[PDB]
């Protein structure tokens, strides 16, 4: 398939807090980030958590829909790999934030066409560690 | 199903012309409305416009999906009525049903109250600002 059903439907609840970022990050420099910068990061991961918790927690999938509901899962399986339910690494590699920050760089991708790396990506992880260390126990 | 997939889609790809015309009508007067504001609504509706179209004839559609294929097949036919006969700017037509997308994108993002207003004075900004790609 070519759809990310999932991504599209939270960022689509997110449109003010993904276009800060996205020209805000514009011509960034990830080893000298403004502060505005760096807010304009946090809000828009932490607008994608709050979309994406509710998703995952009220079950807001069709377990018909073979694709949608094995992507669902995934998400799911991040959710209980940082909340202690199987393990409390929110974090780790593929994990709940790394997600979050792949859907950051998705956003930029389809939206205005710049493919950002690990020097965005590795900062975002940072910024993530710095300001969500309490979203898990 | 109950799902928005196909302007989902379109809209977490037009984040940028989605959040102006949000921001730009939060205090907006439909009865009033600034330069910037008409701006904001036409370029939201244009991109809206592109990828509809797209979707359209590429099918981006999951056909076998009843519901995700009942609302493309509703797109197709509102985008062959305005192609003489043809009434874009018709209820529940092309433009119609992109204004609608607007709304729907305003009520998810930030609980708007708009209503028949709102969508009405959407409606004359497109007539104004498309009719000439039917002429
Ligand atoms: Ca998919
Ligand atoms: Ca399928
Ligand atoms: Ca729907």
């Given at each position: 398939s070519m759809s990310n059903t999932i991504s599209d439907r939270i960022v689509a609840r997110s449109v003010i807090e993904a276009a800060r970022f996205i020209q805000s990050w514009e011509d960034a420099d990830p080893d000298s980030l403004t502060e505005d910068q760096v807010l304009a990061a946090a809000g828009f991961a932490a607008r994608l958590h709050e979309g994406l918790q509710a998703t995952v927690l009220q079950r807001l999938?069709?377990?018909?829909?073979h694709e949608e509901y094995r992507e669902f899962k995934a998400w799911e399986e991040a959710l209980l790999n940082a909340d202690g339910?199987?393990?409390?690494?929110?974090?780790?590699?593929?994990?709940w934030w790394y997600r979050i920050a792949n859907v950051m760089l998705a956003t930029a991708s389809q939206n205005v066409g710049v493919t950002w790396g690990s020097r965005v990506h590795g900062r975002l992880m940072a910024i993530f560690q710095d300001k969500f260390k309490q979203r898990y126990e």
């Open positions: 999938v069709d377990e018909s829909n339910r199987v393990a409390s690494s929110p974090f780790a590699d593929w994990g």
